[PDB]
Design a protein around this ligand. Structure first.
Ligand SMILES: [Zn+2]
Length: 223
DNA sequence: TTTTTTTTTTTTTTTTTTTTTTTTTTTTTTTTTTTTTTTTTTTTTTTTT
């Protein structure tokens, strides 16, 4: 299952310093948690390392829940809990995860590069023939991960008298995909994320930033 | 006219500079085209007393 759900209540109990740090810097703290859990699991099941070589630490019951309309730039790069209704949901897409390239000048397979969520990986030279020239994804030696983009609006009951429901895009990755269906009311925990390529720099108008939530944890509220 | 020292002076290169020649080289935007909606202007089947 490659997914380890850690409650926040008991993490704030046992180790409150981490629980203070985690909302402020969730990317790094979550990377640390993932690697620590991975090696704990390898200690417990040494054979298990052939399976997925990565443990996803999900975090539950994060105390303070901000609703979709109250999200601000104060919340940028922070772990938030919202709640809403899934309105749209792409199919599971295959996203480059550890991507190998072909130098199509000498056919050398450029070594595995980690694909981050906020920047297109582009190699420099190839290490053999030193061509800056064109590369192509080697799709046989690349590994991918499941990617899904959902849209979540505010619950219509939770919307005030004269006001429209606001919606956000969230990104489900690799173990979270297909956990939501349109019309589901979910509790979404994730990083309120700004900095990938969403900035209206293209003279279309104001220099505003589009925002997404890197989902960390999805709780479906139903039977 | 036999012996003998300066003299080049042609041949090896080497330096060595100055000049001309050689070698190298994808990415990123934009745009047309196609296929869609969508409000509006008709126009073609519906029925009555
Ligand atoms: Zn090459």
């Amino acid at each position: 299952r490659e997914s380890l759900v850690v409650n926040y209540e008991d993490l704030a109990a046992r180790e409150h310093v981490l629980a203070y740090f985690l909302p402020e810097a969730p990317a790094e703290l979550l990377q640390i948690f993932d690697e620590a859990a991975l090696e704990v699991v390898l200690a417990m099941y040494p054979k298990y390392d052939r399976i997925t070589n990565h443990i996803h630490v999900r975090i539950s019951h994060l105390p303070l829940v901000e609703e979709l309309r109250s999200l601000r730039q104060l919340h940028l790069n922070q772990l938030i809990r919202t709640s809403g209704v899934v309105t749209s949901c792409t199919g599971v897409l295959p996203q480059l995860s550890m991507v190998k390239y072909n130098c199509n000048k000498c056919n050398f397979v450029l070594g595995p590069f980690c694909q981050s969520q906020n920047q297109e990986v582009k190699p420099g030279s190839c290490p053999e023939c030193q061509s800056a020239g064109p590369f192509e994804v080697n799709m046989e030696e690349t590994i991918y991960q499941n990617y899904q983009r959902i849209r979540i609006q505010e619950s219509p009951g939770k919307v005030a008298a004269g006001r429209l429901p606001r919606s956000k895009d969230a990104i489900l990755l690799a173990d979270l995909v297909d956990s939501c269906k349109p019309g589901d009311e979910i509790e979404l925990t994730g990083i309120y994320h700004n900095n990938y390529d969403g900035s209206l720099n293209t003279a279309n108008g104001f220099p505003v930033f589009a925002t997404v939530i890197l989902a960390n944890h999805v709780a479906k509220k139903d039977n």
